[PDB]
Structures are given as C-alpha cells and as structure tokens.
Symmetry: D2
C-alpha cells in the first residue's frame, strides 16, 4: 500500500521505455503523476504508456535522444502540456565498452560521457528553469554504486556516474532558493531483463556475492526510492546521494 | 497522501516522546505500525501514544533509560507483544556540553558517547536477534549531518554520530543474510520545539544560512524518510547513510 | 629538509608552466626526478625548465595541448627519453565560466569536461602502459575540494573534478597488479600568483573564511603532498583521494 | 632518501612499542624528531628507544595506559621536556572480540571504545593545549579502512575507527586558528608481527585478495604517510582522512 505525494504534476522519466526507467514511470504514474516517458525507442516508450493506462494512470510517450539538447527542451514542453512539470528522473544511460583505461576506445569513452553525464546536464537546464518558474520540484539523477566506488574495465561508466554526484550537488546549491531539489540515486546491480540475459549463471553468482543481501536488486526496489525522493515527503532532501545497493558499498 | 508499507508489525521508537522521535512515531502509526514509544519521560511517551490512538492508530508507552541494556531488552519484549518486531528507530539522543575538545569535561564526553552511541548498540542487540528470528526487518539509526562533518564545540556529539555510521555498516553486513536491514539517517538542523526555544532570532538566521534551502528542517520531513527506510519498499536499502539536510553537506 | 624518493626516473607534469604545476615540477626535480614540463604556454614551460636547471635539476619542456591524445603520447615518449617514466601529474586545468547550471554555456561545459576530465584520461592511456611496461609507477590526478563538494556557479568544474575520483579509482584497480598507483589530490583554494592578481580583496577574504586555517593554501603546500604520493614512500597508497584543503571539507 | 621536516620538536607516539607505532617512532626519529615512545609495555617501548638511539636519534620511553587521562597529561609533560611538543600520533589500539553485534560482549564493546576512541580524546586534550601554546603542531590519529567501511564480526572496532574521523574533523575546526592540524590515517590490513602470527595462511590469502595491490601493507608504508602528515610540508592538511590501503576502499 505504498503511495507517494506526486499527484497534480507531470514527471519526465528519461530512458523510461525499459528496466529501471520503466519501473520509475509505473510507480510515479500509480501515485497520480502525469508521466512523460522519453526514450530512443518509440515503441518501448509507447508500451510503458499503454501499461500505465492499463493500470489506470496518465502518461504520454516522446521518442528522441537525450544527447540532443533540443530534445530535453521538447521533453519539458511535452510534460508541461500534461500538467505542471515538478519531477524529472534523468535515468537514460549506457554501459560502454568492457576494457582497461589503457585499452579504452576514445569513441566509447566519449559516447559514455555524452549520454551518462552530458545529456543529464542538457536535460537539467530546461528542467531546472521550468520548475523554478512554477514554484519548485525535484530532479532525481540516476547514478550508481559506481558513482562512489570503481569496477575494473568500466572506467568511462564509473567516471560519468562519479560526475553526476557533483552536478547534483551544484544544481541543489544553485536552485534551493527556488525550491528545486536535486538528488542522486545509487543502485547496486539490478536484475533487469537485459542483465538477466547477459549474465552467465556464474557471473550472476559472483555479483550476488558482492551484495550483503546476497542477491541483485529489482527495478521496483530502485523505483520506490526514486518516487519517495521525487515526492513532497522528501521536501528537505536535496544535494545528497542515496544508495539502494543491498550493502555493496558498506564493505 | 503518503502511506508506507509498515503494517502488521511492531516498531520501537526510542526517544519517541519528543521532537523527531514523536514525528517518527506518529508517521509509522498512521501507516499501521503498532508503535512502542520509549522515552526517559513517561508522560511525554504517554502523550504521543494518546495522539496516535486519537488518530486511529495502535501504540503503547514504555518509560526508561536506553543506556540500561535491560531496558532495550524490555522494549523488544513489549514491542513483540503488540505484533512481531520488524522496525526499530534508535533516535534517543542528547546535545551534550558546548566546549572545545581541550576543555570538554570527561563525564560530559562519556555521557554523550553513552547515550548517542553505546545505547544504540545496547538496543540493537535484542532488536537484531528478534528481527532475525521472525524473518527480517529494518533498524534506522538516527545519526546527523554531524555524522559526516564537524561543528565547533560539539566534538562528543560529532564523534558519536560518526560512530553510528560504522555500527550501521557492520550490523547491515552481519544480518543481511537474515534479511535485517540497518541504515542511518542524517538530518540537518531541525526545528524541534527545543531547538526553536534555544535559538535567538539571530542564531536561527545563522543556521538557516548554512542550509541551501534557507530554512531549518521540520520533524515530519525527517519522519517521512525514516518511515520510508523502515518500510518494505526499502527492501534493497541497507548499510547506507541517508542525508535529510536541505543541502548542508553539499558545500 | 624535505626530500622525496623520486630519483632515477622521469616525471610528466601537465600544466607545469605555472601555478600549482610549476610548484610540483620544482619539488619533484629538487628530489632528483627528471621532469618533463608540458604546457600550452611554451615560454612558461621553458622558464620552469630553466628554474629547475638553475637549481641543479634535470628537466625538459614540451609545448602542446593535453586535449590532443597524440600530445599525451608524445609527452610519454619525451619523458621516457630522459629516464624511465614512473610519475605523471595530470594537473592542466581551466575554471570554466561563472554561471548557473540552467544558464551554463554548452560550449563552456564541454570545454571544461574536455580539459579537466577527458584530457586526463587521454594522457593516462600511454602513462599507464609505459609504467606497467617498466615495472610500476605513480599517477597523481589534480582534483579539488570541488571533487567532493559543490560551489555555486562552477558546475562544469565541480562535475569534472568529481569525475576524476572515479577515473582514479578505476585505473588504480586495473593496474594495481602492474604496481602502477593512481591517486587524486584535492586542494582547497590556493593563492597562486594568478589567483592573487584575479581575486578582489573582498573575494579573497570570503574564501579565506571558508577554510578553518583562515588562509588560502600555497602552491608549495600542494606540491609537497603530490611529491610524497608520487614517491616510493607512498608504495601502499592507491585509488584514494587526498585533501589538502585547510579544513574546508571538515565542516 | 626520504626525509621529513619534523626536526627541533618532540613527538608522542602512543602504542610505540610495537607494530605500526614502532615504525612511526623510527621514521620520525630518523628525520630528527625527539620521540616519546609511550606504551603499556615498558620493555617494548625501551627496545624501540634503544633502536632509535643506535641509529643516531633522540628518544625516551614512558610506560602507562592511555585510558588513564593522567597518563596523557604525563606524556605531554615528558615530551615537552625533550623539545617543544609539535607532533602526537594517537596510535595505541586493540582489536576486540570477534562476534556479531547481537552476540557482542558489553565488556569487550566498552573496552574497545575506551582505548580506540576515548583514550585518543583523553590524550588529545593536553596535546591540543600544549601545541596551541607552542605555536602550532600536528596530531595524527590512527584510524583504519574500517573508519569508512565495515568488516563483519569487528563492530566495536569499526565503530571506534568511524568515531575517530569525527573527533579529527572537530579538533581540526576548533584549533586551526592556533595552527594545530589534526588528521586521520586509514591503513588497510598491515603485516605487523601479531597479524602475521594470528592469521592462518588461508585468512591472509583472503585479505590479500581484498586489496587491489594483492598484498597486505608493511608498517613502514603507514609510517611514511604519518611522518609526512606530521611534518611542516603538510602545513595546509587538516581535518582530513588519508587512506593507505592498497586500493581496498576503491571497490
Ligand atoms: N544494474 C543496473 O541495471 C543499474 C545499476 C545502477 C544504475 N543503473 C542506471 O540506471 C539507468 C537505467 O539502466 P537500465 O539497466 O534500466 O538500462 P536499460 O538499458 O534497461 O534501459 C535504459 C533505457 O535508456 C534508453 N536510452 C539510452 N540512451 C538514450 C539516449 N541517448 N536517449 C534516450 N534514451 C536513451 C534506452 O533506449 C533504454 O530504454 C542507467 O542510467 C544505468 O546506468 C543501472
Ligand atoms: N536539529 C535536530 O534536532 C537534530 C538534527 C540531527 C539529528 N538529530 C537527532 O535526532 C534525535 C532526536 O533528537 P530531537 O532533536 O528530537 O531531541 P528531543 O530532545 O526533542 O527528543 C529527544 C528524546 O530522547 C529522549 N531521551 C534522551 N535520553 C534518553 C535516554 N537515555 N533514554 C531514553 N530516552 C532518552 C528524551 O527524553 C527526548 O524525549 C537525536 O538522536 C538527535 O541527535 C537531531
Ligand atoms: N585554487 C586553485 O588554484 C586550485 C585549487 C584546487 C585545484 N586546482 C587545480 O590545480 C590545477 C592547476 O591549477 P592552477 O591554479 O595552477 O592553474 P593555472 O591556470 O594557474 O595553471 C594551469 C596551467 O595549465 C596550463 N594548461 C591549461 N590548459 C591546458 C591544456 N589544454 N594543455 C596544456 N596545458 C594547459 C596553462 O597554460 C597553465 O600553465 C588545475 O587542475 C586546477 O583545477 C587549483
Ligand atoms: N592491520 C593492522 O595492523 C592495522 C590496520 C589499520 C589500523 N591499525 C591501527 O594501528 C594502530 C596500531 O596497531 P598495531 O597493528 O601496530 O598493533 P600492535 O598490537 O602491534 O601494537 C599496539 C601497541 O599499542 C599498545 N597499547 C594497547 N593498548 C594500550 C593502552 N591502553 N595504553 C598504552 N599502550 C597501549 C600495545 O602495548 C602495543 O605495543 C591501532 O590503532 C590499530 O587499530 C592497524
Ligand atoms: Zn515523569
Ligand atoms: Zn513535559
Ligand atoms: Zn603569495
Ligand atoms: Zn561542507
Ligand atoms: Zn614490563
Ligand atoms: Zn615482550
Ligand atoms: Zn612481514
Ligand atoms: Zn568497498
């Protein structure tokens, strides 16, 4: 019976067509947020809109690329058309190449930084302005455990996720006076359909052993924390990094 | 319309007769937790129980001193009698002497460590064992911003609050396999009745300036995060430190 | 009488022609490292080489832009020609524009990320491989206090400095077996001659008040910590972030 | 050829009769500090003084218990008799019972807190006052990796080491104006004689795999960082926590 104070407003969820973003969109919509599901994949975004509406909520899809700053502007316009924009979850991200720093391709490095960091900044610019103009709101940036610790052969990803904590702190300091809160969420390894499909039984067991709870997280377990932080109940929470990692970083 | 998945279980709230503890007790009870309100002050604990019952919730008072290990045992037994113990909020605490490290009195130092650290540990022993035996639960330790930064003339307090992050990490690692989660909450300065009553209009303005949001927090703004973290929605959150500080530690 | 175990090897210092980089180059060279001073400013780079040689040390200048990956490769080749490359200090950096996240120039953002983050990665690729090939070494990345806290109107800078902590962690994990250590240094505000010329009296006084020591740091006070971490004395120090901040982040 | 700017002053090293404390005493004395080696074990302290004097240095032994506040006062007086007290290394510590938080001995908990936390505070009171009177100095508190992460079945130890980071921050803030710096060092697992004696080959191999460098640290590798932080070269380093952990906390 979990319910969040996220009604009478619109919410952008970037990369909302799949995995954690999908879970976030469904949880926000279930508590009455009018959710704009943005994604590269138009049909995936539309499927989540349809699921939302089969469960009785409000949502719309917008297909595009968050690395285009024009798209973040179009997303803020499309969200505001549904209801006043007071939530943005900058969740779209990619894993990058699996290689050492020394071997890493320049193209892969630049692509991971562009999506996982620069596109969050691009999206935030219109999000911050819209929320400041309409009395306040919450931006939740999807970081990772890998925003605070490393993981061999994923340096670009780790670097970008670290970067998000600083961007989060700065926007929080700058827009607090406008009652725009900005926070970062740090999930541990989450069992998405893609992760499940990629991991060998042995590789899965290895990752499970790195979490004190002895399992990977579920997308719904991240979505709950995101929905709480985006809600009016979290009105004194800003600038901060919130782990949902099953104890990964506690050792 | 915030509701938390904390029903069909008992919750201990230490120091539940005043301030943050009172707000925590009211929030947990309003979502269906059977709350044991524990406090040195019997009449204050009884007053909170009366408020909970008038609002349609279930609670009971138990008066005593958390620095007596026997009292933490008695609290766990009394809570279990209401419903299976699956939440404990170790919130009781004192501000301590205002003095430099060099001037700090030994008894004053020892008293702050005894209440703000050792009593949390004393309570956790029977809490952890009870929750492990009945299939899992959540312990929320009330730390502070001063668990991660300092504040001149409050060294014993700062020291105790830093200590809680380690006790929290360790219990989380040790009882994760039993599905007992242990987390720490770090509020900024909160406008409890005693904070209000202490601060001159000038000293209040000074502290407000140290929070990006330009105000002190409200007890209910801490209680919301505590209730979320103590609930089934927080099932992948353990070992971690969660700031509710209006941006205090982001600069 | 401070002396560092940095002899019989070469050291790259990027941005070594002025400010903190100059102080690092002078300190390393005075303890026997053969220092390759790299800088956009060829006159400054040659001037620091002349200072080093006047004090009886060994150095050479290479003028160029760290944002060109080919220049980092050329820097490693030129350093290896002096003596085996076992130290690299990725110090070159820019402040970026002063603006809110919402107003921030896209080009200024991208330029700050490019110099302060991507160029460190570009340089690290050949540095890591050279040091792994010759039995180990130390890479010191120049971060900031602003790698762990924010500062209003310098979001791009804060973001890039945060990113460096992750890049540092990851390279440390990946090259530990090759005995290549990678660390980050986090200075507070440092009164370089350039800063002393730029800051108004009022701006300087404001910043001094944010440091417990009540002053800005000296470039030599950063250089000493860099020289220590780059030395054989620091053989068990890797992956970590080391503040030299006069107490800035302790509150 | 490493040398530290620690001459023309006295240095207290608590627990200096063995392991890391012994290495710290030897390294400080070799760079000209007059070292007061304090320890429960008078003969062990005397043996370290004998080694120091054989190597050409100045030292004296003082046997006592750091949990007696009168002993820390006596230690400051004895150090000042050699030369002006400007270094204190609060290194004395014990391990504690190996048990879960739920099973933990109240006696063991209180003993670990008393030595590893309260005695550091007890010694710091006269240390801070003496150094303030002498024109400044440095206090290095021996924390651990376990001041920032947990380790199952060592909760009291982990809790005490976390506490030290707060005590360090607060003393740094309060005595910065007197030029007394206060820092914490966080070693990974170190091959002291008692670690090598107590760990099975299998337990040692397990811990080696938790450090990126694939080995435990040596006492001399902690002593170099302590000596640096205690020296005039570290004059802008205060309030901060410095890991010497072979990458342990970077993942
Ligand atoms: N183990 C995990 O899954 C895990 C753990 C911690 C953090 N995260 C973070 O959570 C977020 C979501 O991860 P996920 O596992 O659900 O991934 P996913 O691949 O299942 O979903 C990501 C979605 O983002 C979209 N997307 C990617 N690039 C885009 C772009 N340029 N423009 C618009 N949409 C774009 C994709 O189309 C996809 O639908 C990411 O930021 C990821 O880094 C994931
Ligand atoms: N600004 C703030 O108020 C603030 C900020 C951060 C953290 N905290 C933490 O919040 C917690 C609650 O503080 P508060 O501000 O609500 O204070 P408060 O004084 O309003 O309430 C504290 C309660 O704890 C009880 N208590 C004290 N010692 C006890 C003992 N030995 N045994 C049993 N009960 C005892 C008191 O009787 C009182 O009812 C404390 O741990 C405090 O450190 C407070
Ligand atoms: N307050 C401070 O000064 C302070 C505090 C903390 C961190 N830092 C960091 O220390 C480092 C040095 O700062 P500083 O104050 O000495 O700066 P500075 O501007 O005085 O010197 C920087 C040097 O780097 C060179 N440089 C800049 N971009 C370059 C490029 N693309 N290629 C090659 N050389 C380039 C410049 O020519 C110059 O000689 C930077 O990373 C900065 O972020 C500075
Ligand atoms: N793996 C490690 O060895 C390791 C790692 C991180 C931190 N540390 C810390 O390093 C410090 C030194 O530990 P060590 O490994 O060298 O231990 P050790 O047992 O070799 O030496 C500790 C010394 O402290 C003395 N001592 C203990 N209690 C005392 C008291 N009450 N009064 C006076 N002297 C007392 C002992 O007599 C002994 O000589 C401790 O704080 C420990 O927690 C050790
Ligand atoms: Zn009474
Ligand atoms: Zn009363
Ligand atoms: Zn000057
Ligand atoms: Zn701060
Ligand atoms: Zn004896
Ligand atoms: Zn003996
Ligand atoms: Zn050995
Ligand atoms: Zn870890």
């Amino acid at each position: 019976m979990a319910q969040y104070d996220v009604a009478d407003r619109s919410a952008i969820v970037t990369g909302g067509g799949s995995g954690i973003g999908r879970a976030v969109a469904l949880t926000l919509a279930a508590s009455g947020a009018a959710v704009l599901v943005t994604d590269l994949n138009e049909e995936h975004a539309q499927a989540v809109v349809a699921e939302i509406e089969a469960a009785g909520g409000k949502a719309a899809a917008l297909a595009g690329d968050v690395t285009d700053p024009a798209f973040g502007e179009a997303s803020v316009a499309a969200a505001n058309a549904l209801a006043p924009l007071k939530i943005a979850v900058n969740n779209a991200g990619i894993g990058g190449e699996a290689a050492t720093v020394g071997d890493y391709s320049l193209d892969s490095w630049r692509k991971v930084i562009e999506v996982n960091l620069n596109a969050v900044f691009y999206g935030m610019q219109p999000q911050l302005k819209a929320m400041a103009a309409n009395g306040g709101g919450a931006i939740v940036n999807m970081a990772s455990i890998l925003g605070s610790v490393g993981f061999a052969n994923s340096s670009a990803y780790v670097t970008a996720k670290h970067a998000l904590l600083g961007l989060t702190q700065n926007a929080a300091l700058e827009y607090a006076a406008d009652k725009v809160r900005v926070v970062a969420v740090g999930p541990g390894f989450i069992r998405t359909p893609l992760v499940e499909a990629n991991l060998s039984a042995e590789a899965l067991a290895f990752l499970e052993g790195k979490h004190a709870l002895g399992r990977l997280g579920e997308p719904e377990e991240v979505a709950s924390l995101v929905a709480f932080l985006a809600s009016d109940a979290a009105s004194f929470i800003t600038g901060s990094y919130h782990l949902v990692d099953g104890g990964y970083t506690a050792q």
